[PDB]
């Protein structure tokens, strides 16, 4: 939920009340009675909690940030799942033994360099959540360095389909591709369904890019296509404008018609939101509020 | 309600308010050692306006059996308790 | 640890802040949430 780990290190090892040992500029801010909200609040403390603050502010203490700088590292390693969460009580029990064994002027200044690049040079972790080359760009640029670029029929639409497929894994942060076994896959979401067999799809689409099929043929592709190729073309449909594969290829009978099939449900869901909200507006059997509703929409 | 009482603080304004707010500020600090909470007449009002009735409701009313029936080991009462439009029964009583 | 130089009257929390205050907010949030089952409030020195 947080952005930075060192703020949680500054939340688990700093005093919540204002002390002059660490925040002098706020502890002296209220001794001299110069504060906007509640100014006159330090005279009326007795000699117990005046001298226990007014001595320690005009000459500060000299504490040791060794126990605090390591929590800005041990947290920064468990935020990125390098360590198990069940385990950080051991490594801080081992790093604090480490940097007190080999302590110097250098290591106290070398940890302090390392609690800055886990703050402002950990912006790469903010970066490839957006560009998602975790598993979407550099894991697919091996796939595009695997397919043959010499297709006999349809030389131009072959390199515009994968030009529209690299855009698919780029405009979606959740989708990713990977190497499992001798073939590459592609899931549209983490914790997600609809895994396409990406090797067994472009091998099915090879020798298929030029057909120029007529518009009176529907039930032939049970022995020609494969339903995951029929689902990969479903996942390429919203990111494919009308200028990719124009009109008369058999993919124009597929990719354009898949956008119309998505174009049905992206307005009939708004119809389905109306019907399920008027069954309780007039009084309708909720068991029979979905049987006849779906049959009108399928 | 009748300012021979509101001056007397029999009823009306309560002890946190007709005291001067410096003095309410005083004794909330001082209860551990010097308590003047015994001296200042906090009133209560026990309000009217739809708490107690007017229109001849009986408070407790004894119900009755109709058709008790007997076996040599048991006894089976058979009541018709009823309450109408008002007098919402607690049933723990 | 390090002999962190302090007065005796605040390094022993006789005249100091409270378990609400000198502790870390990550521990006061822990000490307030676990107050039902795993009490650890008596260990952290309320002074008067």
């Amino acid at each position: 939920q947080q952005v930075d780990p060192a703020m949680l290190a500054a939340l688990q090892s700093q005093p919540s009340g204002v002390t002059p040992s660490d925040d002098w500029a706020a502890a002296m801010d209220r001794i001299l009675a110069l504060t906007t909200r509640n100014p006159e609040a330090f005279r009326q403390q007795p000699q117990a909690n005046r001298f226990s603050a007014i001595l320690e502010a005009v000459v500060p203490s000299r504490t040791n940030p060794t126990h605090e700088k390591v929590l800005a590292i041990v947290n920064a390693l468990t935020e990125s799942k390098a360590i198990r969460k069940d385990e950080a009580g051991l490594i801080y029990n081992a790093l604090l033994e480490r940097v007190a064994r080999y302590n110097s002027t250098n290591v106290q200044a070398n940890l302090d360099r390392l609690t800055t690049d886990v703050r402002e040079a950990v912006a790469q972790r903010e970066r490839f959540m957006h560009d998602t080359n975790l598993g979407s760009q550099v894991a697919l640029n091996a796939f595009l360095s695997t397919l043959p670029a010499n297709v006999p029929r349809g030389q131009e639409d072959y390199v515009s389909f994968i030009s529209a497929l690299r855009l698919l894994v780029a405009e979606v942060p959740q989708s990713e591709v990977y190497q499992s076994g001798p073939d590459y896959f592609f899931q549209t979401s983490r914790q997600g369904l609809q895994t396409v067999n990406l090797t067994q799809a472009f091998k099915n689409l090879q020798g298929m890019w030029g057909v120029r099929a007529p518009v009176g043929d529907r039930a032939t592709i049970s022995s020609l296509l494969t339903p995951n190729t029929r689902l990969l073309l479903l996942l390429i449909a919203p990111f494919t404008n009308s200028s990719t594969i124009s009109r008369d290829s058999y993919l124009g009978h597929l990719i354009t018609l898949y956008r119309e099939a998505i174009g049905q449900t992206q307005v009939d869901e708004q119809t389905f939101q109306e019907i399920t909200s008027v069954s309780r507006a007039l009084g309708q059997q909720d068991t029979g509020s979905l049987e006849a509703t779906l049959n009108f929409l399928l | 309600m009748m300012p021979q009482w509101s001056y007397m603080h029999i009823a009306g304004q309560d002890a946190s308010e007709y005291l001067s707010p410096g003095l309410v500020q005083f004794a909330r600090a001082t209860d551990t050692y010097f308590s003047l909470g015994n001296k200042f007449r906090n009133p209560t009002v026990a309000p009217t306006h739809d708490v107690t009735t007017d229109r001849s409701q009986r408070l407790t009313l004894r119900f009755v059996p109709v058709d008790r029936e007997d076996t040599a080991y048991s006894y089976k009462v058979r009541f018709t308790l009823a309450v109408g439009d008002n007098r919402v029964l607690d049933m723990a009583s | 640890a390090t002999p962190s130089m302090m007065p005796q009257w605040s390094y022993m929390h006789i005249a100091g802040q409270d378990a609400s205050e000198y502790l870390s907010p990550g521990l006061v949030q822990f000490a307030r949430a676990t107050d039902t089952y795993f009490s650890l409030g008596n260990k952290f020195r309320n002074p008067t």
Binding site: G17, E40 | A27, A29, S35, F40, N42, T44 | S20, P47
Partner: peptide
Amino acid sequence: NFASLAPRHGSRPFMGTWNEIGTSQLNGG
């Protein structure tokens, strides 16, 4: 504020509840 009179539990003064300013002890009240 009158904070220099209350026996402070720590830095916060011990300021009592709001029923600690009056009383309503009558026979049946």
